[PDB]
Write a protein that binds this ligand. Structure first.
Ligand code: CLA
Ligand code: CLA
Ligand code: CLA
Ligand code: CLA
Ligand code: CLA
Ligand code: CLA
Ligand code: CLA
Ligand SMILES: CCCCCCCCCCCCCCCC(=O)OC[C@H](COP(=O)(O)OC[C@@H](O)CO)OC(=O)CCCCCCCCCCCCCCC
Ligand SMILES: CC(/C=C/C=C(C)/C=C/[C@@]12O[C@]1(C)C[C@@H](O)CC2(C)C)=C\C=C\C=C(C)\C=C\C=C(C)\C=C\[C@@]12O[C@]1(C)C[C@@H](O)CC2(C)C
Ligand SMILES: CC(/C=C/C=C(C)/C=C/[C@@]12O[C@]1(C)C[C@@H](O)CC2(C)C)=C\C=C\C=C(C)\C=C\C=C(C)\C=C\[C@@]12O[C@]1(C)C[C@@H](O)CC2(C)C
Ligand SMILES: CC1=C(C/C=C(\C)CCC[C@H](C)CCC[C@H](C)CCCC(C)C)C(=O)c2ccccc2C1=O
Ligand code: SF4
Lengths: 80, 160, 168, 41, 739, 169
């Protein structure tokens, strides 16, 4: 399964979570930004690696980073 | 002479090339009629070929064993009209172009909408800058002295 | 409604009364999609050009300038004058005048106040008040239209039959 | 003729005019002094 | 306040000309990077994203059509003007079989005057392969003054179409209901446009082309031929050549149409004098076509209680296997411009290819069959246009599926049922493509390896294992027997390609029976295989344009997008555009093979010279039958052999063809930089270049960015197509003009 | 609307107000997209060069210098007979003059950047003509008109020599 990391440059704009096609990211409470929220990656087993999450990231060099790793039938997007 | 070449004025193969080209042109000329425009055009071709060969012969041009003018670009002023003078001419023209482009970029870079003035050129300012490029060698060695030609550390760098 | 010229056609809706030589003649409605000042300027330019052209054609078929090049009929004078470069000078100066005209018509269309065809060229007066100016404008327009039609007929007849000044 | 002149000031029209003029004077130099292999001087 | 048009919808102003990108909501803010410049041209004609109203899109499309027709009219006017002023058409008229058509002279600069070839007739210029001279002769044009007047008329028509476009966008723009009158539009395009154009052309042929061309074939010089209007005012100049005009139009109105058999014939074959189709046959054909199309135009109900409703016709065509059938197709084709474009472009390209075939098969112009460069150029050009238009139709079908397809409005109809089993279609098409490719190409490779191993009896040749195209030979036999048996009123077969005598004009073969052997079997199956693979790519693009097992929401990414990401193992090129890109590549492959087959087969087994005793000698000598069955044969006896004229063209009047050969090679190789590389490398190189510019204070305000992934692919495919097609263009033209 | 005094059917051009040759002649509006100070400097320099060149024609065809090189009454043919060496020296001397008279700032963007430079005012007045300000304006207008007339005449003389070949006489 791929690896997804969140960095404290998160501004809690939720654009990553609402762009994930496989429900990998979610918004959790935080105290490091104005919005009081930070993205989390608790379901990386469903991560497919499409990187839509970081295409919607407005922070300078990203706050969500997807590191491709071992492959799985879920991560390979295999309907068969 | 230089590199084993010989002047084209004394190159037999050069004259053979001229004679063969003229003979081909005349043979082509034979198949048309009277003072018709095709014959006039072929005659003009023959005249231009003869003039070009004569000018190349009387041009301090060195010809090889193939009867074609070879360029001596080692730097000697004897054959200076082959490379050195055209080199100076191009350097002047290209420095003019680069200088006027850079001046226009830096001039409209201090306005409210720098990007707009790049797709829609300020033709008055463009004409003002373009005709001022004749002093580009002097302008360049008056802006480099003042430190206005080179940026120092506001330039961006990658992570490593 | 019921334009003066064509009594059974409606008024062109762009020519009410406030133009010299306005009898409400626009059946195909050229004024409905083109500026009135532009069309007036074009008409006056055509009038003046064709008046000069008709007078020149008729005169040059009678009187010739000294020289062998000027010894041709007006019908064949175009190919001779273009070769001698005589028409090149006229082209150059007409192009200068027409560039100044480009500026003038642009200014007239974008405000200004210059009447169509009004270059203010008036060494003599010939027009002292508004009434005289209107009458002379009407005379110029009528004479110009007549000369345009006359030059058309002259050229067509001369080309059809290579005759001298009587082009019958 | 205020926006038409601004349209003529756009990059494509200006580049086309400049390149047409440039090719023009190059072609005419090569017509009046053809077959120039070296500097004329 | 008309019910069909809106008056003065858009003001005629130059203000928006000075605001580039005003049409797009995203581009209107102005450029910030160089990507804006490329996006400006990529969205210029995408009227769907510029307005949210179908009416505005339709009006823009209508005015764009007017602009395109004005451009076409200007091009035709230029062609006629060149024929009038810079051509040897008058000299070619008096010697069609010995003068090469030329209509473009080259200025004497930088030594380029060598391009002015010895085309004959005391003329110097570039030989013309567009066949305009033959077309003008078939039109009865016997003077360059007529060409000048046609050019003037073309200029006037082009201005008229420009004015029409301006008028119908800015002064009186039609409403949506006017555009959606597909019944009225079909009625008019079928009766008025097609039928009345055929009728008018039949009238012109009968009254102008029939007498003038008959006099020309009789040997009458063009100067003593009467002016075309005299054939109308004088019923005696045409009644001598065709002694049936003496009865006037009475036989027509009295149903005694047999009297007009003098100039309305049904002969078939070719004119023995000119080598083209009998112009009497052509006039009769156009008359019949006119009547048929006028009749066909009275089909759809427009404004009276008469005719058909296309909605009622489609909705009644259901079936047990097709559910709701064609229900909803009328709404699809009356609310989506992209669906109409798909159908029209596909059928238009297919029509262009059919035209290309029927052109050389039955030469319709005088002295065009013996002008081999003209025939080759016309066929290749029309086949290329057809392939491009077919790929465009597939592209716009995919665009309709992505954008204008409504799932709710297409419940259980044909479109829905096709998407529901797209897997089966694509899998079986995949199997068919593999079967056809394996067989055709592996038979080629088997022939090559058997020849390389010295086993000549193991090939798939005529003197070996033979694959006779018996089905095509049966059809050829049926056509050569048609006159008198199935077409009893025919005097000769439709085309001598099916069989018959060798038709030669001036010792040059015009048409001849095209024998089909094992070599034609293999190349025909190659054609089928390439066409099937192109169809596979395009149909996979259309069907999987909305969703797939990989990306269940591919429709939300649009028609044109590079990917969905490196995940799922990699989701490159999943768009539908990336399928029109690959399909463009495969169309290039297929059309290149088709034109190669045509060129080699014609040069080897049709074209050539006929000896006075009747011995036929071809351009190459019949090497197609035995050497077109191996890839080495194609490489050597066709490519290497016929490329001799291109490479040896330097110093001659065909040197431009060698230069274009080299330049097209350069462009084709240039394409591979964009096709093989990726955007990240070029962006990071532009980073260092920008560093240098910033160091010299000359970095542009518009930030330079590498071309987008989709634009990189588009540039690559455009350069690839240009280079390959130009290389084949120069090769074909130089080869067929030299010999 | 004011309308120009020279071209009476055209609006009065802008940017010419405080000048010593203003007759309102600018139909093409060259003063709108080009600096008026630079335009006057260029007009004055072109006029002065044309005046000197016209006088040079008239003197050359009449007087000439001793020597085989300086023996052509025709100015156009004298340009070729004299050779490149005398002409290049004139070119370099004119360049030296240009540099020293404008004191470095020689271009359209550099000149008049700081202002304080009356167009055409090099301060050259050794004979003292121009101390009285009353006749100064008349002298400026006369210089401008003579310069324009000399531009027209310099073109005329050069083109007469090209179409005939002998001289001006
Ligand atoms: C539309 C205007 C027009 C044009 C295009 C021509 C063209 C021609 N004329 Mg012509 N002509 C004109 C008007 C015109 N004329 C008028 C109005 C007269 C009556 C005075 C004449 C009297 C005339 C004679 C007597 C002769 C010609 C001849 C010719 C031919 C060669 C010499 C030449 O240019 O004329 C030279 C013209 C003149 C000597 C008189 C011209 C007087 C002008 C038109 C009136 C003033 C108008 C003003 C200058 C407008 C200013 C223009 C503005 C842009 C600055 C040439 C085809 C000659 C020829 O070859 O005949 C076949 C010849 O012998 N013309
Ligand atoms: C834009 C650049 C340019 C420049 C500087 C020139 C310069 C010149 N042209 Mg010219 N010309 C150009 C573009 C240009 N041309 C183009 C694009 C065309 C149309 C193809 C022509 C067609 C043309 C003709 C037909 C003639 C000139 C002539 C001339 C010469 C006298 C005027 C001069 C050297 C004339 C000349 O010197 O010939 C004797 C001449 O008769 N030109
Ligand atoms: C990039 C390399 C390169 C170089 C160095 C040259 C150099 C040359 N080429 Mg060439 N050429 C090139 C690429 C190149 N070409 C390519 C890629 C092509 C294919 C399109 C051609 C096609 C070509 C042709 C067809 C011809 C030349 C000719 C020439 C010669 C005459 C140049 C000329 O017109 O000068 C005169 C013009 C100028 C000097 C312009 C500058 C003048 C300005 C206005 C001065 C103003 C400031 C003071 C010159 C030696 C011509 C020739 O005679 O060959 C010997 C010729 O007929 N070339
Ligand atoms: C739309 C199709 C088309 C095309 C491809 C051409 C192409 C050409 N035309 Mg042409 N022409 C066309 C339409 C077209 N024309 C029409 C509609 C007319 C009628 C007005 C003409 C009238 C015309 C004339 C009268 C001449 C050409 C010439 C030429 C050749 C040189 C063009 C040139 O250097 O101009 C350069 C243009 C510019 C720099 C303007 C920017 C070129 C092959 C010339 C030629 O072949 O010379 C021998 C020539 O003399 N054309
Ligand atoms: C008999 C009547 C008639 C005729 C001849 C045509 C002919 C044409 N229509 Mg058309 N149309 C008609 C009725 C007709 N239409 C009706 C009733 C409707 C309403 C449903 C439409 C709606 C329509 C649309 C929406 C479009 C067309 C288009 C076209 C053109 C197709 C391009 C082509 O084949 O090039 C052949 C070209 C020629 C043969 C050139 C000569 C044709 C000239 C222009 C005659 C046109 C006839 C015109 C209708 C007369 C009106 C004159 C006006 C003063 C009223 C063609 C010119 C398409 C096009 O290209 O748009 C411009 C297009 O997009 N038509
Ligand atoms: C009747 C024909 C027709 C029409 C009306 C359209 C119309 C349209 N197409 Mg389309 N298309 C067509 C044929 C047609 N196409 C064909 C035949 C193909 C197959 C190649 C395609 C493939 C295609 C794709 C793949 C796409 C479109 C798209 C579009 C839309 C936007 C077009 C645009 O903005 O381009 C503006 C015009 C340009 C950018 C011009 C580009 C220049 C071309 C590529 C190079 C031409 C070179 C030329 C031959 C000269 C080379 C010579 C060399 C020596 C210089 C528009 C609705 C796009 C879209 O989003 O649709 C909604 C899209 O993605 N089309
Ligand atoms: C010469 C190069 C080449 C070759 C051989 C192929 C071959 C093929 N392409 Mg293509 N393709 C190419 C270049 C080529 N392509 C390029 C440059 C592009 C870029 C645009 C594409 C883009 C492309 C797409 C987009 C598609 C294809 C498809 C196909 C397949 C069609 C089905 C078929 O015939 O399979 C049969 C295989 C052959 C004919 C190859 C030769 C096999 C030999 C003759 C027979 C078997 C030999 C035997 C097994 C050897 C065993 C011994 C060995 C173990 C030592 C086929 C594999 C389609 C596909 O997936 O298939 C349906 C498809 O959709 N291609
Ligand atoms: C060819 C077979 C054919 O067209 O028969 C026609 C067959 C009959 O379908 P329908 O009777 O339902 O069609 C009635 C209406 O839809 C008219 O189109 O269509 C199919 O079943 C499609 C299956 C294609 C299978 C490919 C093999
Ligand atoms: C005279 C002239 C202009 C004169 C104006 C003058 C003096 C007045 C100027 C001033 O009042 C103003 C305006 C304003 C004041 O503040 C300044 C002054 C100075 C007071 C232009 C001439 C302009 C002269 C021109 C344009 C001549 C063109 C000639 C051509 C083209 C000849 C071509 C041929 O000779 C060839 C080439 C080959 C031959 O075989 C064929 C032909 C055709 C004959
Ligand atoms: C055309 C021209 C002037 C045209 C003026 C016009 C139309 C004026 C019109 C008006 O005034 C009137 C009529 C009335 C006014 O109220 C309105 C306007 C409209 C203002 C000047 C040309 C002027 C032309 C000039 C000055 C040309 C000079 C050429 C020189 C010096 C050449 C030198 C060489 O040729 C040699 C000697 C040898 C070569 O081998 C090398 C070189 C170096 C190239
Ligand atoms: C080189 C290259 C670039 C860089 C290319 C750029 C930036 C294009 C630059 C184009 C210039 C600026 C304008 C065109 C200049 C030409 C001389 C004009 C065309 C020639 C005419 C005759 C048409 C990419 O961005 C890219 C992206 C994806 C895959 C491959 C590639 C790729 O290979
Ligand atoms: S960039 Fe190239 S590779 Fe990476 S995802 Fe987009 S398409 Fe697939």
């Amino acid at each position: 399964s791929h690896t997804v990391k969140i960095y404290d440059t998160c501004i809690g704009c939720t654009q990553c979570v609402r762009a994930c096609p496989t429900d990998v990211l979610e918004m959790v409470p935080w105290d490091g930004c104005k919005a009081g929220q930070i993205a989390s990656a608790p379901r990386t087993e469903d991560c497919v690696g499409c990187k839509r999450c970081e295409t919607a990231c407005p922070t300078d060099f990203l706050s969500v980073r997807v590191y491709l790793g071992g492959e799985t039938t879920r991560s390979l997007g295999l309907a068969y | 002479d230089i590199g084993g070449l010989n002047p084209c004025k004394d190159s037999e193969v050069f004259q053979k090339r001229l004679a063969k080209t003229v003979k081909k042109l005349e043979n082509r000329l034979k198949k048309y009629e009277e003072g018709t425009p095709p014959q006039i055009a072929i005659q003009q071709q023959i005249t231009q070929t003869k003039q070009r060969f004569t000018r190349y012969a009387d041009s301090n041009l060195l010809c090889g064993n193939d009867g074609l003018p070879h360029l001596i670009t080692d730097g000697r002023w004897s054959h200076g009209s082959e490379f050195l003078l055209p080199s100076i001419l191009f350097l002047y023209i290209s420095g003019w172009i680069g200088w006027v482009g850079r001046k226009y970029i830096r001039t409209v870079g201090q306005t409210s909408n720098p990007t707009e003035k790049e797709i829609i050129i300020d033709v008055p300012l463009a004409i003002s800058i373009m005709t001022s490029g004749f002093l580009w060698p002097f302008a360049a060695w008056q802006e480099f002295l003042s430190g206005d030609l080179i940026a120092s550390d506001e330039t961006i760098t990658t992570s490593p | 409604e019921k334009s003066k010229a064509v009594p059974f056609l409606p008024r062109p809706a762009a020519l009410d009364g406030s133009v010299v030589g306005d009898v409400g003649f626009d059946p195909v409605g050229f004024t409905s999609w083109l500026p009135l000042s532009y069309l007036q300027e074009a008409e006056i330019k055509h009038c003046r050009i064709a008046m000069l052209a008709t007078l020149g054609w008729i005169v040059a078929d009678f009187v010739h300038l000294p020289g062998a090049v000027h010894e041709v009929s007006s019908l064949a004078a175009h190919d001779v004058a273009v070769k001698s470069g005589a028409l090149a000078q006229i082209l150059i100066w007409t192009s200068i005048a027409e560039a100044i005209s480009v500026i003038a018509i642009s200014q007239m269309l974008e405000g200004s106040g210059r009447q169509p065809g009004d270059f203010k060229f008036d060494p003599l007066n010939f027009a002292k008040d508004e009434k005289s100016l209107k009458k002379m404008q009407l005379s110029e327009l009528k004479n110009g239209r007549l000369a345009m039609l006359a030059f058309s007929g002259i050229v067509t007849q001369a080309a059809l039959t290579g005759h001298a000044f009587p082009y019958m | 003729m205020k926006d038409f002149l601004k349209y003529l000031s756009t990059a494509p029209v200006l580049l086309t005019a400049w390149l047409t003029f440039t090719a023009g004077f190059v072609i005419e130099i090569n017509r009046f002094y053809p077959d120039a292999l070296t500097f004329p001087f | 306040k008309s019910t069909i048009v809106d008056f003065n919808p858009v003001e005629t102003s130059f203000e928006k000309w000075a605001k580039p990108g005003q049409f797009s909501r995203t581009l209107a803010k102005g450029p910030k990077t160089t990507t804006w410049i490329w996006n400006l041209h990529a969205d210029a004609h995408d009227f769907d994203i510029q307005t949210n109203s179908l009416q505005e899109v339709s009006r823009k499309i209508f005015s764009a059509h007017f602009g395109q027709l004005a451009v076409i009219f200007l091009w035709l006017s230029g062609m006629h003007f060149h024929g009038a002023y810079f051509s040897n058409y008058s000299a070619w008229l008096t010697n069609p079989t010995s003068t090469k058509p030329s209509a473009q002279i080259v200025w004497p600069i930088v030594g380029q005057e060598v391009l002015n070839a010895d085309v004959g007739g005391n003329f110097q210029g570039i030989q013309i392969t567009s066949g305009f001279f033959q077309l003008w002769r078939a039109e009865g044009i016997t003077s360059e003054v007529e060409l000048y007047w046609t050019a003037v008329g073309g200029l006037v028509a082009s201005f008229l179409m420009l004015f029409a476009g301006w008028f119908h966008y800015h002064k009186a723009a039609p409403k949506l209901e006017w555009f959606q009158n597909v019944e009225s539009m079909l009625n008019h395009h079928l009766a008025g446009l097609l039928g009345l154009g055929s009728l008018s052309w039949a009238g012109h042929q009968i009254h102008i082309a029939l007498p003038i061309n008959k006099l020309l074939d009789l040997g009458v010089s063009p100067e003593e031929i009467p002016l075309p209007y005299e054939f109308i005012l004088n019923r005696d100049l045409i009644a001598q050549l065709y002694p049936s005009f003496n009865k006037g139009l009475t036989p027509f109105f009295t149903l005694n149409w047999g009297e007009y058999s003098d100039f309305l014939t049904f002969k078939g074959g070719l004119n023995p004098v000119t080598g083209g189709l009998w112009l009497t046959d052509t006039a009769h054909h156009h008359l019949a076509i006119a009547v048929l199309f006028i009749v066909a135009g009275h089909m759809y109900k427009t404004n009276w209680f008469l005719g058909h409703s296309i909605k009622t016709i489609l909705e009644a065509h259901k079936g047990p296997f097709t559910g709701e059938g064609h229900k909803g197709l009328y709404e699809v084709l009356t609310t989506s411009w992209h669906a109409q474009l798909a159908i029209n472009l596909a059928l238009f390209g297919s029509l262009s290819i059919i035209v290309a075939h029927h052109m050389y098969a039955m030469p319709p112009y005088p002295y065009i069959a013996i002008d081999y460069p003209t025939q080759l150029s016309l066929f290749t050009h029309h086949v290329w246009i057809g392939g491009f238009c077919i790929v465009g139709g597939a592209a716009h079908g995919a665009i309709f599926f992505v954008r204008d397809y409504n799932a709710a409005n297409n419940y259980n109809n044909l479109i829905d049922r096709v998407i529901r089993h797209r897997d089966a279609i694509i899998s079986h098409l995949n199997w068919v493509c593999i079967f056809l490719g394996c067989h055709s190409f592996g038979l080629y490779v088997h022939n090559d390896t058997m020849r390389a191993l010295g086993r000549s009896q193991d090939l798939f040749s005529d003197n070996a294992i033979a694959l006779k195209p018996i089905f095509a030979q049966f059809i050829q036999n049926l056509h050569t027997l048609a006159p008198g048996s199935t077409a009893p009123n025919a005097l000769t077969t439709v085309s001598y390609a099916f069989g018959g005598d060798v038709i030669s004009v001036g010792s040059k073969i015009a048409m001849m029976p095209i024998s089909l052997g094992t070599a034609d079997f293999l190349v025909h199956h190659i054609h089928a295989f390439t066409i099937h693979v192109t169809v596979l790519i395009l149909l996979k693009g259309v069907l999987y344009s909305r969703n797939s097992r990989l990306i269940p929401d591919k429709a939300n990414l649009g028609f044109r997008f590079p990917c969905d990401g490196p995940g799922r193992g990699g989701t490159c090129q999943v768009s539908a555009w990336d399928h029109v890109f690959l399909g463009l590549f495969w169309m290039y492959n297929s059309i290149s093979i088709v034109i190669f087959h045509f060129s080699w087969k014609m040069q080897s087994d049709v074209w050539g010279t006929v000896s006075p005793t009747g011995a036929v000698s071809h351009i190459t000598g019949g090497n197609f039958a035995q050497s077109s069955i191996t890839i080495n044969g194609w490489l050597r006896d066709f490519l290497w052999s016929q490329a001799a004229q291109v490479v040896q063209s330097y110093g001659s009047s065909l040197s431009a063809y060698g230069l274009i050969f080299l330049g097209a090679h350069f462009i084709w190789a240039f394409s591979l930089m964009f096709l093989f590389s990726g955007r990240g490398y070029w962006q990071e190189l532009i980073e260092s270049i920008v560093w240098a510019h910033n160091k010299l204070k000359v970095a542009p305000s518009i930030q330079p960015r590498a071309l987008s992934i989709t634009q990189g692919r588009a540039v690559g495919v455009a350069h690839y197509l240009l280079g390959g097609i130009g290389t084949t263009w120069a090769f074909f033209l130089a080869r067929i003009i030299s010999v | 609307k004011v309308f120009s005094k020279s071209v009476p059917f055209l609006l009065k051009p802008a940017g010419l107000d405080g000048m010593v040759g203003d007759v309102g002649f600018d139909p093409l509006g060259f003063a709108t997209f080009i600096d008026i100070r630079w335009l006057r400097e260029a007009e004055l320099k072109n006029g002065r060069v044309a005046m000197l060149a016209f006088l040079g024609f008239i003197v050359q065809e009449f007087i000439r210098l001793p020597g085989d090189l300086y023996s052509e009454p025709n100015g156009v043919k004298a340009f070729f007979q004299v050779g490149p060496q005398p002409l290049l020296q004139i070119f370099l001397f004119c360049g030296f003059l240009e540099f020293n008279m404008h004191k470095g700032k020689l271009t359209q963007v550099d000149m008049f950047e700081d202002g304080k430079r009356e167009p055409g005012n090099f301060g050259f007045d050794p004979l003292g003509f121009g101390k009285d300000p009353a006749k100064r304006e008349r002298y400026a207008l006369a210089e401008l008109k003579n310069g324009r007339l000399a531009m027209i005449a310099i073109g005329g003389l050069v083109h007469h020599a090209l179409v005939t070949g002998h001289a001006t006489f």
